[PDB]
Amino acid sequence: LSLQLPWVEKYRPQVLSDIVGNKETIDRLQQIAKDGNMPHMIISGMPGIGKTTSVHCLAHELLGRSYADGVLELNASDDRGIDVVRNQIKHFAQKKLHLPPGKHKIVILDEADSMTAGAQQALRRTMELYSNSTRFAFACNQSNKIIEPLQSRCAILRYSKLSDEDVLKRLLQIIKLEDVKYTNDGLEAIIFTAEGDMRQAINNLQSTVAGHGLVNADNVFKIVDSPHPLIVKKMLLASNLEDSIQILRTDLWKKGYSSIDIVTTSFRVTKNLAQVKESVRLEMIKEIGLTHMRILEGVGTYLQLASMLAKIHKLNNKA
Amino acid sequence: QQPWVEKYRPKNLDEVTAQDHAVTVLKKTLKSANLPHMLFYGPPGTGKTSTILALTKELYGPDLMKSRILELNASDERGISIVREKVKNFARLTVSKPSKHDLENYPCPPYKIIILDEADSMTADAQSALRRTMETYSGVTRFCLICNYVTRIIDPLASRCSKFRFKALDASNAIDRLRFISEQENVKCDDGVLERILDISAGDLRRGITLLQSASKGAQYLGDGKNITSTQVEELAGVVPHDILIEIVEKVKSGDFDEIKKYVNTFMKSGWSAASVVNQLHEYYITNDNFDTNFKNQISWLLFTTDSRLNNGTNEHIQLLNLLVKISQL
Amino acid sequence: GEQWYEKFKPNCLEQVAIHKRKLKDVQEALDAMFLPNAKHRILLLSGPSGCSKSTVIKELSKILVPKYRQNSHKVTEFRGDCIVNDLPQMESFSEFLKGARYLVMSNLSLILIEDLPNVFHIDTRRRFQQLILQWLYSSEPLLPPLVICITECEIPENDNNYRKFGIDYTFSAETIMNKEILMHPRLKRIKFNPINSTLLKKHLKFICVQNMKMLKEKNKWNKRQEVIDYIAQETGDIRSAITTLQFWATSSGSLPISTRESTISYFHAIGKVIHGSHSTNNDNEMINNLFENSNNLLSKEDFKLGILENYNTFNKGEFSISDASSIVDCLSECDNMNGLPESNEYGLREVRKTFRNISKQGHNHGTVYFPREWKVRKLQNSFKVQAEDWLNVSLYKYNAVHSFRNITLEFGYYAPLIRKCQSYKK
Amino acid sequence: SLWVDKYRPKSLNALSHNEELTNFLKSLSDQPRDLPHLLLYGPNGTGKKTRCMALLESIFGPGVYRLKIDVRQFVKLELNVVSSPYHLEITPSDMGNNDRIVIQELLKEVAQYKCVIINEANSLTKDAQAALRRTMEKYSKNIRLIMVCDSMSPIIAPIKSRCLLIRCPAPSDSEISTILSDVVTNERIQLETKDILKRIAQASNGNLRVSLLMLESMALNNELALKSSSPIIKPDWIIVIHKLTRKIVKERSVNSLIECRAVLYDLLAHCIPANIILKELTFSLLDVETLNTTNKSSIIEYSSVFDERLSLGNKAIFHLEGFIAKVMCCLD
Amino acid sequence: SKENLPWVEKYRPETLDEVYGQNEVITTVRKFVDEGKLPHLLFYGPPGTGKTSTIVALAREIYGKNYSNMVLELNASDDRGIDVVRNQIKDFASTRQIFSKGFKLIILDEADAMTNAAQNALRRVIERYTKNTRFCVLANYAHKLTPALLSRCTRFRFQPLPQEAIERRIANVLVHEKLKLSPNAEKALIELSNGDMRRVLNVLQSCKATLDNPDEDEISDDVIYECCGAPRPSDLKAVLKSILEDDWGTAHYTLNKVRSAKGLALIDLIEGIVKILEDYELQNEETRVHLLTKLADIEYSISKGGNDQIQGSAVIGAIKASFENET
Amino acid sequence: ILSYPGIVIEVCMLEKESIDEAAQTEIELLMET
DNA sequence: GATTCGTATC
DNA sequence: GCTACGGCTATACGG
DNA sequence: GATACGAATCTTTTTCCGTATAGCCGTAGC
């Protein structure tokens, strides 16, 4: 008895105009739609920044009425092997579909980073023979997964993290189109917890409005939780050992985070850290590795994490 | 015939000694039918397999045992496929209908027991498939996981299964059982004997029974008819004699590297084990009141590190020489 | 109305973006392989992606095949997408090679194999290896020339359980062709290098001068030089460079210019870890980029062995012994972490930090080498065979068993000096 | 043919170098029925395998020293098997890591007081021992395993608990010299003095096998004769290790480290175990009189740390090179 | 036949009102289901927090009498590879409703132990069939999940059960079993469970078994400690005092007495000492580092086996050495 | 399905959700021929 | 990426 | 008697 | 004639057994 689409799906962009963030790339996509000479593209970026939606919108605005038989949206959910590339993709590309001037079929190979090597090798061959009628539109979170021979003939349009202003603009549009009572601090908290993920921000706003009504900082933070990569950074950069121990025991242990997650997030933060010496960074990485080994062997306990923090503080503050 | 360890294996739950808590829980749940999933753990040779076999034979009986009990151990394959197919299919199977004799002379609980002995050697990938398997098939099947290290058992499985710990069989726990075995086997021992046997076989009774059997066989072959002395079971086990230990200590006191190396070479020529000499050195150094607190702390840490290195499977000669040099330079 | 890598395609041999020496050696090899004598039967071209490894074969065949053909022009590229009805996919290449051998006189045509069959599958891979092996050892008096352009590329991370290795890491010729084919006297492996900046700039300028009206219309003809220089300096791929230039020219705005990122080679990565990168002076950024772009190369145990065998190249090996001790100690510590990514990060960060505090200007460096482990394992296998034979002959003569450890340590050495030294006397 | 095999004892009474151990073996053989699982631990060259053979002959009468060599196959792990009447040989050396499956199959085939001898049990991996800890306990009515190992340290606690610990001390100098005298009496070499036998014993470090082999080598070199100043024919790898020790204590540089690495690679190619290579390098370094006590203590500490690291590691070259670098830094 | 069940399986909540502790999650999902629309949920937290008893109760309350044909449950006990995800989940989430009852819930318990390829193939199934199918993800380890999968999944964190909820559940179990529990024994159960209902239920079942008369006898703290072989606070405090104050011989004697008279394991004593040492002054920062590092090393060594006497001596020496940085 | 009163085979099948709206429209258009 | 040799050209 | 079909089988692929 | 530039070189390589089924062969029957 629901019949109600999620806010993620409800206000999904259908035009290349309401897609917020990456102004230059969106303008380039608009120019492509205006002209029609779409080159092969490999969109890369973090999850939930409009990569798939941009491809679908440009396909809709290029094919237009011919969208029914002009686009072949393949995905990881569908079977993507050498056989499927050699038959279904080959027949779709080989199909002689009449199109408006300067229009080409768009094979939307979404989640192309999960495709098999042989499938990509067959994609090389099929793209070498069928690129005057079809233009593949890859969409992956990492361009390195697509083989370099494929990237040779495909233009690269890497997407960047959505800023706190474009996300705010789209969130305000959703609020106005939905008539939801908001608070400035609430929207700031939503943006903060989004971490540049527009879909996550939409989901958080929907959960907040559906569970608590008014969207303020208190109601947002009583359902959504502060990002743990930030508490991990706070505890790793703590000058005093007691402060880090408390930050761990109260915000990652009693909060309900596994030790292995705490170790992996610590390693990632140390990899992407700043204002720390290289020797200190490598010593912290070594300590995190020793702790990770201890966790994997089966000794996963708060004591091991406390020992890791003690070692890090010892190597930071010396003897 | 049979080894004394297998000859005196506890057949019923009333023969398992010093594991009072777990055995009394099993005996009380024998009357009822609410036995939960069990996670038996403890030191090696503490009576886990014997206890589970006794409970199995008491609950169902010899005829119903084959049809209502499945046993898997490290001797057989226990991978993810095995857990997914064999264990799941066995648990799904309806419990066999007991015969009239079985119902008359046995409790015949409506559940069945899957015994996964030596579960600490099972990979974490295969331990994740048991989680729901031991939960949805809970009213028709029971699970008994036996291991020596609980750390090798994943947290979900440890939470699902009841935590029964088997105590280490020291000289105040299995002494009654050892005396019973000696009396039944007609073994003559001096006063104080079987206590050194339990101490050397620390946290284990099978080693103690083996030592007792070997000492009895040696005494029988000698033909003197005299009682077994403590030094006999000490040498038979592999304990370094006290004179060799005190010579090692004296060489350590004289901090000459060459003399220590030569005497360590001679000791390794003698063929003794590094673990036994390290344990005896610990017993000598920690107990001796002449040493001060700082020296005792440092030597305790050094012995801990040496034992940790030895357990990894390293060369005994190098570790022993390094330990003795460290003790000398302390 | 089409991609600029087409249309503006090479029409003669001069337009081909290839170095003079590479062109001359390829032409010499082709001319030697078209003679009635068959000293070389196959030409194993190899190199990175888009390094003019395909556009030169057609141009050569334009002025070579017709000259030596009979009277009574192009290539015969193998199509890996043709699914024949009554033909298994493994048998597709078998039929291709068994029907391409009839092109000798009045039908001469070069056989080009660029799109290899699914060599990631073991069965068809070994079937292809056998098929090309039969080609080299064929008793056929006359066979047409054959070229296999194996485009080397770093195979990314995959969910395959084991499926051995080699082809799951790289798509090089050694991972497809076996050692027997590579060392065959009739195989000539002419490797290719990334296109130099000079030829890239020349061809980009040719493309720009062939279409300048839109360039000046979009106020880009005056900014053309910087774009060409950046494109030719960032990538060595001609097709990718042309695509990026087309994308920039057709665009109307301020979109930053981006191109495909090349994968760092094994020796290149070792040099970067040991010496550093001139582009980036930040060790953390360089290490993070190296791990993100190429993690399939830094995860193999060969790279740690590579560092162990090549860190003695800094200042020809005149660095302090303490630095070497620290490097080897940290390498052993990483080996003692059962391949965790943290160990892989630490074993390179420590080396780079150690080789940074001792970086001295005006110090010549030596050359590197692949780790000497394959030779050691082959020698160990030979010693295994020797010990097995000695223990076999030992048990057959007399009933005495000897452990392999003692054979390696005591028996192996004394066995000659005992048995053969008493053979002298007999 | 070989003198070690020529003068190998074939019975418990023929053994005349342990005495007390021989009496204990007689005590064990007095009641062959109740035979516990036996684990012999002692220095290499003691004669533990010969003692096992003699004990099996005592239990199973004559014909134990028979040699029924055959070839088996496991899944293609085609390990060779040395069969004998109530005696089977399993060597963990021929199957490293993958030993669990083959030992399981062999044990279950033998089960069908049959004795299976598994020498050098230290080479058994933690998985094969995990299978054996239950294989021995379960089928302890139709098979009795007897395992001989140099040191029972890498043996898991359950296996040592289920088995019986028997120590085999290395031969003493006087008795091994007596054995050498018996050898030279049976095959006359016309020794100038008996002191050369004592020096050979001192150069064997309690290894009777080494003493017999070097005695035969020296006799062959001196044309079936012996000399007071006859050279000691030590194994080649020991000489290489001594040369490496001299290089380490002489050239303290990075190029010298590369030369040491090349020497270590040659030693590894000679299929010499890495742990024993590290041990011999350490003990040869400690024998240098130039180095002081602090240097030797640092050497032994580094040796302990790096042998632990090698035990907990896959590639052996790293640990050996690290130990060499650490000792080289300590020297200067 | 429910009496012939373990207390961890016959006390499983059947309705959302019996899932204590996770009040915020229960209220939020109740608001979602009352307002019709239910977002794709993802339940995360420590084991035994009620991540399955909540989703099954929610499914029962949504699809009354239709929990069978509307809910598809897949766990780690069954294969969840590429083929399974691409066939079974797709067929279930691609078909129309049985009686137009709503959306088709898909419970994926223990989704952390899933291959990344399956986790990436599931994302498009989740997004392309969200109109008539809502996915629920149960996982104890968040690092095992693809970040995109986390992005397209509303995250609910099942924190460890608070003391009040466990006390209420213990009271319900006592009422249902006609049992008596001392308040000190209840607090010992709270500290032993450390946020886990199954541990409390198992310990209560073992205590009831351990009692000679499960009806007229009360479960005391001594029973709660004897049934699990856990160290009492008194012995832990005595061990800590002996190690911190008395000399090396008397401390070792006290440690041996404590670990022998009750059979207490050394790792349990180490954990107790660690807990008792957290709320300590320890002004010097080096004492904390020494304590944590040495105790972690000893715990790691114990996890691999060894000589218990040597490990206990190591514990004593480590604690003494760490507390020498105090003065 | 029907072939003692023979054998009766009673089967039931669910219908796919039919995501595409034009799919039904194009099927209807095709059925007009 | 570093070294050595090698043409080719302004 | 030959057919059209049920069962057998060699097998390219599967995971 | 000096110098930036570019090529060669610095490299090693291992498996699923089973199975639903398209074509073939024996055969129940009209």
Ligand SMILES: Nc1ncnc2c1ncn2[C@@H]1O[C@H](COP(=O)(O)OP(=O)(O)OP(O)(O)=S)[C@@H](O)[C@H]1O
């Ligand atoms: N720039 C944007 N403007 C408006 N909505 C956006 C934007 N980026 C993402 N969204 C929302 O995100 C949801 C789906 O975004 P997607 O494009 O599917 O995510 P994505 O960028 O493709 O990342 P992945 O790899 O597919 S998880 C929809 O609800 C969109 O409305």
Ligand SMILES: Nc1ncnc2c1ncn2[C@@H]1O[C@H](COP(=O)(O)OP(=O)(O)OP(O)(O)=S)[C@@H](O)[C@H]1O
């Ligand atoms: N509590 C006990 N009472 C009597 N005999 C015992 C007891 N515990 C162990 N034993 C003896 O130990 C032998 C069997 O012990 P097991 O239960 O097989 O060993 P364990 O407890 O499983 O430890 P393992 O084998 O390392 S898993 C028999 O000789 C028993 O008599």
Ligand SMILES: Nc1ncnc2c1ncn2[C@@H]1O[C@H](COP(=O)(O)OP(=O)(O)OP(O)(O)=S)[C@@H](O)[C@H]1O
């Ligand atoms: N001046 C040029 N030089 C080379 N290629 C050119 C040039 N102008 C256009 N091209 C095109 O760029 C492409 C380069 O082709 P090649 O590099 O020879 O093929 P390739 O090396 O096999 O690429 P891979 O390995 O399949 S990614 C072809 O499509 C050419 O038509």
Ligand SMILES: Nc1ncnc2c1ncn2[C@@H]1O[C@H](COP(=O)(O)OP(=O)(O)OP(O)(O)=S)[C@@H](O)[C@H]1O
């Ligand atoms: N809030 C609660 N109130 C009462 N009993 C609970 C509660 N949470 C869990 N339980 C009990 O604990 C048992 C196990 O909890 P489950 O929800 O089935 O598993 P889980 O909590 O999701 O932990 P994992 O991660 O699946 S091992 C249930 O069957 C209940 O008996």
Ligand SMILES: Nc1ncnc2c1ncn2[C@@H]1O[C@H](COP(=O)(O)OP(=O)(O)O)[C@@H](O)[C@H]1O
């Ligand atoms: N009592 C003995 N008298 C003479 N030789 C002996 C005696 N014991 C052992 N040996 C010699 O030892 C050799 C075998 O040693 P081995 O069993 O390999 O030692 P280990 O078991 O330490 O490897 C035989 O060649 C034999 O000549």
Ligand SMILES: [Mg+2]
């Ligand atoms: Mg998407």
Ligand SMILES: [Mg+2]
């Ligand atoms: Mg057992």
Ligand SMILES: [Mg+2]
């Ligand atoms: Mg090409």
Ligand SMILES: [Mg+2]
């Ligand atoms: Mg659950």
